[PDB]
Ligand binder design. Structure first.
Ligand SMILES: [Zn+2]
Length: 474
């Protein structure tokens, strides 16, 4: 007998096919059957008429490394239908690094002395011992590696330092890491050469992991950054994942046509993937960057001046008698939201076939970017339903089947007999992102229930207490 059957709803199986009326039976942590299950005995037959039953959403781009440990409920994500998170992005991973004051943007994961894992395996062991509500597919970050090995980050790494970082990366992969990420855009790795990155990532071919990247530049020099990324992919001979693809800065608006063409062309000869979030504003460490600071900028948190959280940077700068660019140093370390993208480009990138959905949520932020709480429902509701950017099955595929495939998450991402029971029950008519920049932590609408490995983690708009997530391996 099945533990339960989700009956009377419409199944969108995650294979990018129109939904069909069918029941979904679960036994233990597996989807036992799909279709007319009236003849199957079940201990519970849950009515989900008028709802869609889809695979659990897989957040392809998170910075939930530490949040998984400190807030196992993972409410920001399960409330949106997320059942699996990919961590350690943009070269930023919680482990391996024992440091009381890690360099920005590593501080985006810190809650105070959070970087206490000397070995990547220690981190994974911690997760397994006290599992979060969602599954975790963890990558090790190149910048974290640099911080752990290099006494001076403002230069290229020596052969010895590269050897030290490669050893840590190899141990991480051996321990279960699904890949290695880089973020040469940030200070810790700005001086890292392409060759350094290649040598440190050599182990990916041996362990079969992926190379993920926050490209060196996403504006004026994005073509060069894209070419570097493709080159790295060819040298390593592993799948590459371009993180939160965008074209930032007014001088680059409309260039998504150009970048997507280059990416599509690359996909014809090598393994390339990409993800993006559904918003026109970015968010990360407060940084002295003339493009990031060109437009509206909001502070998400501020160490030296906590009372600045939520304030508009232009106001702060103007009142301190300086430009936003010049006032940044005295406010660091801090975080911010940057309105530097254009809706047309965001829509073009989301619509681009292969683009997976990734939130890039920064969970520890005092006044966070709403993507942390509304990314997935925003794609399913606002973009798919209300704007018709793509049919619902395609929007679902972009956050389930496609993603599971690109990250090698076996037996997940599809509503298929035999696959793991990571599932979401949502109302296609009402699903919507409630989080706004003004109120960035509002729970999404239309999310009925969420299951991870068969156990309900989200029901009646609350965490059930089921710490059902598992550390996954590629
Ligand atoms: Zn990034």
């Amino acid at each position: 007998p099945f533990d339960y059957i989700l009956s009377g709803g419409t199944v969108i199986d995650g294979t990018n096919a129109p939904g069909r009326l069918a029941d979904v039976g679960v036994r233990g942590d597996r989807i036992a059957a799909v279709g007319d299950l009236s003849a199957s005995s079940a201990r519970r037959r849950i009515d989900v008429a008028g709802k869609v039953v889809s695979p659990g959403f897989i957040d392809s781009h998170t910075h939930d490394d530490n949040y998984l440990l400190k807030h196992r409920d993972m409410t920001p994500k399960i409330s949106q239908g997320v059942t699996t998170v990919v961590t350690g992005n943009c070269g930023i991973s919680l482990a391996p690094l024992a440091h009381a004051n890690p360099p920005a943007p590593l501080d985006l994961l810190d809650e105070g002395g959070s970087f206490r894992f000397a070995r990547f395996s220690d981190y994974l062991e911690a997760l397994r011992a006290a599992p979060p509500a969602v599954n975790a597919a963890c990558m090790v970050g190149h910048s974290t590696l640099r911080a752990a090995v290099m006494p001076d980050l403002r230069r290229e790494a020596t052969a010895d330092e590269i050897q030290a970082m490669q050893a840590l990366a190899d141990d991480a992969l051996a321990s279960g890491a699904i890949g290695i990420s880089t973020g040469a855009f940030y200070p810790p790795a700005a001086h890292a050469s392409t060759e350094e990155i290649i040598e440190v990532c050599r182990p990916l071919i041996t362990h079969g992991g992926v190379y993920a990247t926050h490209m060196r530049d996403e504006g004026e020099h994005i073509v060069q950054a894209l070419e570097e990324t493709f080159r790295i992919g060819r040298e390593l001979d592993v799948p590459v994942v371009i993180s939160h693809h965008k074209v930032m800065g007014k001088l680059n608006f409309g260039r998504s046509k150009e970048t997507l063409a280059l990416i599509e062309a690359a996909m014809a000869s090598q393994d390339v993937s990409l993800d993006a979030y559904p918003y026109v504003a970015g968010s990360t460490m407060l940084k002295q960057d003339r493009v990031l600071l060109a437009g509206r900028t909001l502070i998400t948190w501020c160490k030296p001046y906590p009372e600045l959280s939520g304030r508009d940077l232009e106001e702060i700068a103007a009142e301190r008698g300086k430009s936003k660019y010049d006032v940044v140093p005295e406010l660091q370390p801090a975080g911010a939201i940057y309105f530097m993208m254009d809706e047309p480009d965001v829509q073009r990138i989301l619509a681009f076939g292969p683009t997976m959905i990734g939130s890039a949520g920064l969970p520890h932020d005092e006044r966070p970017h709403p993507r942390l709480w509304g990314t997935f429902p925003r794609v399913l509701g606002h973009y798919s339903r209300d704007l018709g950017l793509f049919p619902l099955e395609t929007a679902v595929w972009k956050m389930t089947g496609l993603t599971a495939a690109k990250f090698g998450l076996a037996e997940r991402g599809q509503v298929q007999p035999g696959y793991y029971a990571d599932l979401v029950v949502f109302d296609p008519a009402t699903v919507a992102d409630s989080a706004t920049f003004e109120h960035p932590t509002e729970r999404a609408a239309g999310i009925h229930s969420v299951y991870v490995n068969g156990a309900a983690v989200w029901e009646d708009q609350s965490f059930t207490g089921q710490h059902a997530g598992r550390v996954l391996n590629r």
